[PDB]
Amino acid sequence: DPMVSKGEELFTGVVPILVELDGDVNGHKFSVSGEGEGDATYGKLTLKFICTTGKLPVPWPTLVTTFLMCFARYPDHMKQHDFFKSAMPEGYVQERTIFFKDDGNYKTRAEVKFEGDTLVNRIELKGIDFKEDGNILGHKLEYNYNSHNVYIMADKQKNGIKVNFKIRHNIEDGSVQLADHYQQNTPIGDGPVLLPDNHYLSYQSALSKDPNEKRDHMVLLEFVTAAGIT
């Protein structure tokens, strides 16, 4: 299928990635840069993010979802449902509202596309209505991350997809902070895209620290696999 080919020929091997984020949460401004690589053959991403403005004013775990669904591994039987690769190289826009139960919300706009051989994710993030002393602005979330499925459905009238899901971040006292994600993606180009049947992506995420890094940062290892269309 020459449409499936175009996506295979873009993602076949290891692809370099660059991430850039500008954020303002409750007027606490910050910028983050990430670099790493993805190998969609294995659904694998390896990334390191650095807060280039100093201290990150929110917990690194709260940004993991915001910081590349094009690197999902779609099983062979599911390749006709991979919207994300089908939009490349022109890319797609990924927008979110993330509602932190009993606290503030993040609104995010990203553009994911190739710049030459490099896959780029440019993000603006605005957070409003946070509690200065809540779990987020008060840094009470643990530095870890649970596995989650993400359910993708077509958004046919917008030539794109909608995605809905809950992340539960562990709090230091042993409870959980719910982060309800609402998401929409639309292609940046005017060409055809694969609009999927309902399926999900399964995420595993591991957070760590670079022992030789003195700046505020996060090392992120993710594996992502499509399923749910037997």
Swiss-Prot record:
Effect on the protein upon substituting residue 206 to K:
Abolishes the tendency to dimerize and leads to monomeric fluorescent proteins
Effect of substituting residue 49 to L: In mut3.3; shifts fluorescence lifetime from 3.03 to 1.88 ns. In R10-3; matures to the red-emitting state with excitation and emission maxima at 555 and 585 nm, respectively
Keyword match Cytoplasm: no
Q: What is the effect of changing residue 163 to A?
A: In GFPB; leads to enhanced fluorescence at 37 degrees Celsius
Q: What is the effect of changing residue 42 to N?
A: In EBFP1.2; shifts the excitation and emission spectra to shorter wavelengths and increases quantum yields compared to BFP
Record's protein name: Green fluorescent protein
Q: What is the effect of changing residue 145 to C?
A: In mut1.9; shifts fluorescence lifetime from 3.03 to 2.74 ns
Q: What is the effect of changing residue 105 to T?
A: In EBFP1.2; shifts the excitation and emission spectra to shorter wavelengths and increases quantum yields compared to BFP
Q: In which tissues is it expressed?
A: Photocytes.
What happens after mutating residue 171 to L?
In R10-3; matures to the red-emitting state with excitation and emission maxima at 555 and 585 nm, respectively
User: Mutating residue 80 to R has which effect?
Assistant: In Azurite; shifts the excitation and emission spectra to shorter wavelengths and increases quantum yields compared to BFP
Reported effect, residue 176 to A: In mut2.1; shifts fluorescence lifetime from 3.03 to 2.50 ns
Oligomeric form and interacting partners? Monomer.
Q: Which domain of life is it from?
A: Eukaryota
Could you state what the record's PTM comment says about this protein? Contains a chromophore consisting of modified amino acid residues. Maturation of the chromophore requires nothing other than molecular oxygen.
Function (record text): Energy-transfer acceptor. Its role is to transduce the blue chemiluminescence of the protein aequorin into green fluorescent light by energy transfer. Fluoresces in vivo upon receiving energy from the Ca(2+)-activated photoprotein aequorin.
User: In the UniProt record, does the keyword Ribonucleoprotein occur?
Assistant: no
Q: Which Pfam families match?
A: GFP
Gene (UniProt): GFP
